[PDB]
Structure formats: structure tokens, C-alpha cells
Amino acid sequence: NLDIIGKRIEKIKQEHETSWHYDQDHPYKTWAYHGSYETKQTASSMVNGVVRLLTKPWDIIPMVTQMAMTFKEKVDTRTQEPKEGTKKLMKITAEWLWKELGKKKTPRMCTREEFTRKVRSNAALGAIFNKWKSAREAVEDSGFWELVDKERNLHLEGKCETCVYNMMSRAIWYMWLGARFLEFEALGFLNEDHWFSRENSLSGVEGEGLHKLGYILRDVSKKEGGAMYADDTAGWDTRITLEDLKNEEMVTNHMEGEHKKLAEAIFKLTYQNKVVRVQRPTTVMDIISRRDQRGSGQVVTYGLNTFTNMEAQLIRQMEGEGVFKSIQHLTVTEEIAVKNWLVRVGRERLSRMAISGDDCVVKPLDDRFASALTALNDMGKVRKDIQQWEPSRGWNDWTQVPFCSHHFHELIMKDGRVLVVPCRNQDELIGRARISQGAGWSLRETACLGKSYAQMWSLMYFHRRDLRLAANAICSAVPSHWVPTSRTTATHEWMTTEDMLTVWNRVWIQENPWMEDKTPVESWEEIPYLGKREDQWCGSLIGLTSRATWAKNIQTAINQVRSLIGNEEYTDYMPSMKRFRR
Ligand SMILES: Fc1ccc(NC2CCOCC2)nc1
Ligand SMILES: [Zn+2]
Ligand SMILES: [Zn+2]
């Protein structure tokens, strides 16, 4: 309690000393309360007019249009302590997993220089507005780094003053850029040096890209075993136990010198003890603490989520295989059986999984996995939309498994080569491309965001008739040389001014390890679509009157957007499609 968080609390107390009141009508049951103080403020979703003008048929589809319009009672729940058998399974598994992840990697500190390059090329690092405007300005000023230095030396002393979370099934915990630096310095190596790559972790997919995930799931499907399981956890971040946070900290056992002490302090002072500020309407700022749950930077959150998910799923596999009999207590010889399973088959069992933070697919040895629920439930990783003790539904076909919000099709080219392509309901793809975040967008910046979605569709979703047509229309309506942009950046090969056919060939043919024949494709007409009925099943409007009129009259829509943008240099991309080619 207060010896580790007090200083941070003490400090905030004084910045609002003409406001501090121990409110008595405070809602928190599971968050420890400390006090309140005066504040007054809230960024909703804006429409991208370039994408909307070129997707007119979707103006009357509520699944698209409702996406642009508009539980914090899950953060305020608690998770019971796991039993001694569960705690032992996790500690053995975590010890073993860090060693395996560390065999071909060296933990190291990330640098001011690396941090500065990050901010000067924009990533969602989750900082705040104060003393400096943007992140870009604070990183150039030496005052900031003196602030960073004071905290840095405070952390080496086992103490914390300024590392405080700000809240805003989603809950995002912003910190000041300084606290974000110190987290990146100590733990950025997990992401920067690709600890969760598939090559390094066997279960992981970090840095893969949507064009690889289907091939990875098809490779898991080739293993002998049972159904493919893809259980979602109900609110994963809220189910992270203090025992989980202590198993994650064991990465520090692999460190040395300064780095070890700096990493130990992030885990002790900011992860295993937290201070948060929350906006209440009744409008005060509440200063609450708790020891458990996930509240880190989103990039460190991804790697530690992947780690603890890999651990949980290996333990569920051990349970299905009868490695241990009960979670109440491991015998002395059960401990040696678990250790020996890990050493003997651990790497094979990791290769049976695809894990992306809280998202997993597992192809276990057999279907005993389906009813192996005691460890999973007792670790607190309770499955979503199924009754606590009901067996998991198994998927018989890798093409029907959900993963990273997608499913995957096998698509055969006219020349016999096999593509495994990513897919999701087309209403979701169109509805997302019609949304922008934040204020002060010029027409040119709105156009370049539309172009980013269009190029993503040409590379990932070329097999959907409506998206290849709409992508060609947007790229025809935006000036040819204008550069695609985003405000929150997986691999993003569509973010380029290179010819999209050249990028398609590099991604799907040249650099694709599942494609033996490297013959380049010479035109978009060589590049296939889903079957017409499969395209409709996944949300295509082909066969509707609205869609036929849109496709026939597309040059009129393109010219409407060109007239709004004005006299600029444009290319007509529609003749790359058979139907507009004379
Ligand atoms: F590009 C296309 C693709 C399909 C289509 N219509 C067909 C959809 C399936 O039932 C027969 C008609 N029109 C244009
Ligand atoms: Zn601190
Ligand atoms: Zn599909």
C-alpha cells in the first residue's frame, strides 16, 4: 500500500490543495480510493467524405452507417487468488518460457535516440498534452530529460513520483511522455528485438502481417490432432492476476547491471502498484490505486499478454494430456513430470498455437482439451459467451477459424498457384474506412487517409469484387503523387507511393515463403476473386441494383471528388479491371 504509491499521491494532493476532499459517495469497491479535485473537459468519430462519396450504395446499409454514430463496470471487478497447484504450474511454465524466449535473444535497454526517432515518425505511444504541446516538442527540450533523469534516479532508489495512469470492452491508460520513456527504456526490447516473432517464440505472430496469418493457421492445421480451438477471454486485461504480473517480472532474471534495476522498478512501482486519475461526472478527478490487472503501454501490454496467453494455453494443453491430476496441489513427482513435458515436447506444443496478445488458436494433441477447464478457470482466464464448465466448440476447418478479427480463404489462381487470403464481413471494412479520428483535417489529409484504406484493400482484400472496384475508384480520385497517411500506424506495405501491382508481386509472390514458383504477375486481371457466392456470403453487394448502378457510373463519382479536390494530376486506374477495359 501507501509507502510505494504515497509520494505520487502526496504530490497530486498539493497541485490541487484548494480542492482535496475525501468524497463519501465514491463508487469504487475493488479500486482503493484516496481523494478528488476540480477539473472540466470531455473526441468522437468523424466521417471521411472522400471514402463516403465513392461508396454511395453503403449510405443505406445500417451496419455501415451506424459505425460512425455515438464496460467500465468490468475494470471495477476482482479476480480470486489461484490455488497452490495452479501457482506452481504457472511459475514452472513461466520460468521455462522466458529461458526459451531468451535462448537466441539478449535483453538490452532502448535508447533516448530510439525513443526520439519513434516520436518523430508517429506511433500511438499514449502520452498527454502540461508543459510542452506535442511529443515532438518535449523530445527536443533538455528540461524534459532532466525531469526523466530525476525519475530515473528515483527508480534506481526503488521509489516513484510522476509515473501515474490516466483512464479514458476498452480502457486506455495514458501516462506522461517521461513515464513512457522509462517503460520503453526498460521493456521496449520485447517489441524492438521481436521476442514474440514466430521464429523466436513458435506460438507468436509479432511482425507477421495479415497476408501471413492465413498461411500460419494452415500450417497449424497440418499437425496431427483434434479440432482447432479459438476461445476468446471475457475482458483479458481485467483478469491479469498479481501472480501473472510476478511471472512476467521473471524476465528481469535474464538482465544485468542498471537495466535489471530499471526493469525491476517498472514492474514493482508502475505495474504491480498503480496510481490512476479518472474523470467522474458527479466533474472531479478520482485518484485510485490497485495492485493487479493490466495497465502498461499498449506495445508492452501486447508482448506480456502474448507471454501470459502462451503460458495459460500450454497449461490447458498439459491438463488435457493428463500431465497433472488436480490444481489443488502438485505432488513432488508431478512437478518433475511438468518440467519434463516442457523439456521433451514444450517447443512442439508451442508450434501448435497462433497467439496475438489475448487472441489464440490452439490445435491440441486431441479433443480432451475441450473439457480441460479447471486450470484455465482458476488462472481467471474465463471464456466469453459460453458457460463456465461447458466444453469449448471445436473448429473442423482452418478456413472457418476466427483470428485477429479475420477468417482466411484458400484461393487458386488461373495458373494453379495457391493464395491464402485474409477476409472479414465487408460492411466492417467499408464502415471503418469511412471514419477518421481527431480534428483539423484538411481536404488533402482526408484524401491521403482514403488512399491509405484503398491501397490496403488492393493488397489484402483484392479478392472482394466491391473493394477492388472502390479501391481503384479512390486511387483514381486522389492525385497520383499524394502520399498515403494515418494518425495511428503489424506490417503496413500499402503505406507507399510505389505502383500497387509491384507491391502485390513483392508481397504475394517474391517474398512469400509458401509460393515456390516466383513468376511475376503482369496485370491485375491475373489476380483472382472469391467465388461469386462466397463474395456475397462475406457481405458483397454484387447482384443488387444499387451496386450495378454504382459500378456502371463510377467515373461520375470519381469526377465529383476530382472537382472538389481541384485541378491536380490524376491517373485513371479503372481500366486495370476487365469491365472498364473497352
Ligand atoms: F462482378 C459480378 C459478379 C457477380 C455478378 N452477379 C452474379 C451474382 C451471382 O448470381 C448470378 C449473378 N455481377 C457482377
Ligand atoms: Zn516513476
Ligand atoms: Zn470471407
Q: How far apart are CA 266 and CA 1, in angstroms?
A: 16
Q: How far apart are CA 340 and CA 332, in angstroms?
A: 13
Say which DSSP state 525 is in: G
Neighbours of 299 (CB within 10 A): 20
Q: How far apart are CA 106 and CA 129, in angstroms?
A: 35
Helix 242-249 to helix 298-320 angle, to the nearest 10 degrees? 100
417 C-beta closer than 6 A to ligand 1: no
What are 141's three cell numbers?
A: 527540450
Q: Which residues, in sequence order, are CB contacts of 457 under 8 Å at separation 6+? A: 429, 433, 464, 467, 468, 470, 471
Which phi and psi (to 5°) does residue 570 adopt?
-120, 150
Residue nearest to ligand 1 atom 6, measured at CA: 543
- Residue 420 host element (H or E): strand 418-423
Neighbours of 234 (CB within 10 A): 15
What are 185's three cell numbers?
A: 527504456
Residue 423 marked ligand-binding: yes
Cα 430 from chain centroid (whole Å): 20
Cβ–Cβ under 8 Å, residues 453 and 433: yes
465 C-beta closer than 6 A to ligand 1: yes
Q: How far apart are CA 341 and CA 101, in angstroms?
A: 17
Three-class secondary structure of residue 411 per DSSP: strand
Which phi and psi (to 5°) does residue 182 adopt?
-65, -35
Rg (CA), the chain: 26
Q: How far apart are CA 280 and CA 528, in angstroms?
A: 53
Residue pointed to by grid coordinates 467515373: 555
Q: Which residue type is seen at 555? A: Q
Alpha-carbon dihedral of residues 287, 147, 16, 283, nearest 10 degrees? -50
Which phi and psi (to 5°) does residue 273 adopt?
-145, 130
Q: How far apart are CA 562 and CA 570, in angstroms?
A: 8
- As beta bridge partners, residue 356 has 359
Cα 118 from chain centroid (whole Å): 18
List the chain domain ranges.
51-55+404-580
State the Cα angle at 453 between 450 and 458, rounded to 5°.
125
DSSP string over 418-452: EEEEEE--HHHHHHHHTEEESS---HHHHHHHHHH
State the Cα angle at 148 between 143 and 151, rounded to 5°.
130
- As beta bridge partners, residue 289 has 32, 275
Cβ–Cβ under 8 Å, residues 290 and 31: yes
State the Cα angle at 492 between 486 and 496, rounded to 5°.
75
Q: Please state, in angstroms and as integers, the Cα–Cα distance from residue 30 to each residue in 24, 175, 274, 523, 551, following that order.
A: 15, 22, 13, 60, 56
Neighbours of 273 (CB within 10 A): 19
Ligand nearest the Cα of residue 534 is: 3
Neighbours of 82 (CB within 10 A): 20
Cβ–Cβ under 8 Å, residues 240 and 255: no
Cβ–Cβ under 8 Å, residues 49 and 442: no
Helix 545-552 to helix 554-565 angle, to the nearest 10 degrees? 60
Closest CA relative to residue 293, chosen from 311, 276, 315: 276
Three-class secondary structure of residue 228 per DSSP: strand
Residue nearest to ligand 1 atom 10, measured at CA: 543
Cβ–Cβ under 8 Å, residues 553 and 45: no
Residue 163 marked ligand-binding: yes
Per 3-state DSSP, the chain is made up of helix, strand and coil in percentages (nearest 5) of: 50, 10, 40
User: Ligand 2 is a single-atom ion; what residues have CB below 5 A from it?
Assistant: 151, 160, 163
Say which DSSP state 54 is in: T
Q: Please state, in angstroms and as integers, the Cα–Cα distance from residue 155 to each residue in 77, 177, 189, following that order.
A: 30, 16, 19
Cβ–Cβ under 8 Å, residues 443 and 564: yes
By DSSP bridging, strand 353-356 and strand 359-362 are antiparallel
Q: How far apart are CA 524 and CA 515, in angstroms?
A: 18
Ligand nearest the Cα of residue 160 is: 2
Residue 254 marked ligand-binding: no
By DSSP bridging, strand 165-166 and strand 284-290 are unpaired
Q: How far apart are CA 582 and CA 578, in angstroms?
A: 8
Closest CA relative to residue 218, chosen from 420, 360, 372: 420
Closest CA relative to residue 5, chosen from 246, 236, 275, 203: 275
Cα 518 from chain centroid (whole Å): 32
Say which DSSP state 520 is in: P
Which phi and psi (to 5°) does residue 362 adopt?
-130, 125
Q: Which residue type is seen at 150? A: K
Closest CA relative to residue 399, chosen from 531, 207, 507, 233: 531
Q: Which residues, in sequence order, are CB contacts of 367 under 8 Å at separation 6+? A: 226, 227, 394
Residue pointed to by grid coordinates 499521491: 9
Residue to substitute in 532, 534, 538 for testing ligand 1 pocket (most ligand atoms within 8 angstroms of CB): 532
Alpha-carbon dihedral of residues 49, 493, 201, 379, nearest 10 degrees? 0
Q: How far is the CA of 535 from the centre of ligand 3 (A)?
A: 7
Alpha-carbon dihedral of residues 383, 384, 386, 390, nearest 10 degrees? 0
By DSSP bridging, strand 435-437 and strand 45-47 are antiparallel
Residue nearest to ligand 1 atom 8, measured at CA: 543
- Count of alpha carbons within 13 Å of 102, Cβ hemisphere only? 14
99 C-beta closer than 6 A to ligand 1: no
- Residue 89 host element (H or E): helix 84-102
